[PDB]
Amino acid sequence: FTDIPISNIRRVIAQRLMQSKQTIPHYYLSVDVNMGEVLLVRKELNKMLEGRSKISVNDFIIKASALACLKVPEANSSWLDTVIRQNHVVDISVAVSTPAGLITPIVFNAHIKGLETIANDVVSLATKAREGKLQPHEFQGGTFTISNLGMFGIKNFSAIINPPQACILAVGASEDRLFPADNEKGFDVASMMSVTLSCDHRVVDGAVGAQWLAEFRKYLEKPITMLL
């Protein structure tokens, strides 16, 4: 065997994860979201952009998460052992994997930023994270975390809540699945994505988490409804 010394950064991350799993009673809720309309809308938006920017699926996911957080503010809360702080702004931390570990750059005001602005912010913060130039205020804080591992082929997974937040959305890969249809063949093909929200049961109960996931699924399945 080989003993690799633990860095101070890794020790801090491990201590944060220990604190989260010891003080936050996690419980996980998983749903499936149909992504055909999102893919069509994304293709049309990318065609219209004419190479000025590129809209990714994670941008749609971040926007839908911010809007669902607005609709269900309980998922946008924090437990402080005396009061439940209900944040009125949605600062979406985005999990990014770098050679030094996992870091969470924050897209601030994702509930009011547009898809192009969100995409540009995500690209800029990802480049900063990969280059190791992130400032502490750019990754400390936030009210809701999104960790997307679909690019690695994960069907679904359950993540750890980043304190002091109340939820974290774990995003898996999009795969084509067969579904019943009232057609001659008897079936259709739909590109579905499995998302698992890990909730702090002190703040978000089962009904509230389910309502949040339903709102998120509705927003993704009808992208034009993000205009409302």
Residues 30-59 close enough to bind a second copy by CB under 8 A:
30-32, 41, 44-45, 48-49, 55
Give 14 or 132: the residue with its C-beta nearer to a second copy. 14
**Which long-range contacts (C-beta less than 8 Å, at least 24 apart) are formed by 161-164?**
161/20, 161/24, 161/26, 161/198, 161/199, 161/200, 162/16, 162/20, 162/93, 162/104, 163/16, 163/19, 163/20, 163/23, 163/24, 164/78, 164/79, 164/80
- Residue 73: asked if its preceding bond is cis (omega within 30°), the reply is no
Running DSSP on this structure, what letter comes out for residue 165?
A: B
Give residues 184-223 in contact with a second copy (rule: CB under 8 A). Answer: 185-187, 189, 194, 201-202, 205-207, 209-211, 213-214, 217, 222-223
Dist. CA 78–CA 214, nearest whole Å? 21
Kindly state the helix (H) or strand (E) to which residue 17 belongs, with its residue range. helix 8-23
Give 25 or 132: the residue with its C-beta nearer to a second copy. 25
Whether 201 is a known active-site residue: answer: yes
Give residues 141-160 in contact with a second copy (rule: CB under 8 A). Answer: 147, 149, 152-160
Judged by CB under 8 A, which stretch of 76-84, 124-132, 134-142 contacts a second copy?
76-84
Catalytic residue among 3, 32, 121, 201: 201
Contact residue for a second copy among 12, 14, 124, 127 (CB under 8 A): 14
Residue 193 backbone phi and psi in degrees, to 5: -125, 135
Q: How far is the CB of 106 from a second copy (least distance, A)?
A: 16
Kindly state the helix (H) or strand (E) to which residue 37 belongs, with its residue range. helix 36-49
198, β-bridge pairs? 28, 168
Dist. CA 113–CA 105, nearest whole Å? 16
Contact residue for a second copy among 36, 116, 130, 163 (CB under 8 A): 116
Asked if residue 114 binds a second copy (CB under 8 A), the reply is: yes
Give residues 117-136 in contact with a second copy (rule: CB under 8 A). Answer: 117
Q: How far is the CB of 186 from a second copy (least distance, A)?
A: 6
Tell me how many residues contact a second copy (CB under 8 A): 90
Judged by CB under 8 A, which stretch of 16-24, 121-129, 130-138 contacts a second copy?
16-24
Picking from 199, 188, 153, the residue whose alpha carbon sits closest to that of residue 36 is 188
Give residues 161-180 in contact with a second copy (rule: CB under 8 A). Answer: 176-180
Catalytic residues: 201, 205
